[PDB]
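User: My notes are a mess, but here's the protein and MYU's SMILES. Can you give me a structure?
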Amino acid sequence: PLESQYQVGPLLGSGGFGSVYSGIRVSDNLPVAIKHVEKDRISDWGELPNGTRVPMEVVLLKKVSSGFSGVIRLLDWFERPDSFVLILERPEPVQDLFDFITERGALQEELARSFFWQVLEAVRHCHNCGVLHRDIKDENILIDLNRGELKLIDFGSGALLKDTVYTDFDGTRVYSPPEWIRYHRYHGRSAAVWSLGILLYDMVCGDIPFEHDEEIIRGQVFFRQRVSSECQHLIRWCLALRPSDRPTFEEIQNHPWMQDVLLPQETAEIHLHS
Ligand SMILES: O=c1c(O)c(-c2ccc(O)c(O)c2)oc2cc(O)c(O)c(O)c12
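Assistant: No problem, the inputs look usable. Here's the predicted complex:
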């Protein structure tokens, strides 16, 4: 019943999400990640089913924790005078999609298809559980390099899912949709599909398509790499300017470009030198 049940390792990263460390649970040498969030710096707070104030990330992680390996699982959490400490699972070996794309450039379509499909399955899982991520992007995706499995992380900018309009947003601007930029209003699903469009382009071209607000609003997509027409079609669909013109998750998964996806294990054998 303390913090010394884990042997703390090196710092993995720090940013708007706080500070995350590599760790090992001494109880059984299980690889873990240890995230510390200062209370002053917490955006949105939630409340646990049993009445007690916690960071929204904790509520959301509990709602999605299950057998599904598509989302990083919350093993435990603690409260401190001025911070919260989350204990999360940690694949080993691992690499985040942002670094993987920095090192390999534009990913081959077969690989981007496997990864994109897995992201789709995970976002669907979150939505079934009543959770909206709101910061889907390469830096918030981990690759279990041995099994070829992607895991979604960092629900700190997330919210309970609803059908009404959202007037707040604290995720990544360049992954944010035109309707946010222009009116500070979005619906959850359509906004998610837009970020998924940004993420697919990122995967197949090696960089995000838009850097400035004027480009997001204009919505014209230029391809800087060789990309098949089907893939270009799916990306442009996801990046439709009107929210209602974007595809649903079902429409994305039944799109011609998404057929014959490789299983994660096959994916690691062919593309991850596993
Ligand atoms: O295992 C994790 C993990 O759970 C997380 C994680 C999990 C939940 C969060 O909210 C979050 O911000 C990060 O992050 C990282 C980041 C790394 O660079 C790495 O090598 C890792 O192994 C991990």
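The chain has two domains: 1-92, 93-274.
User: Great, I'll file this with my notes.
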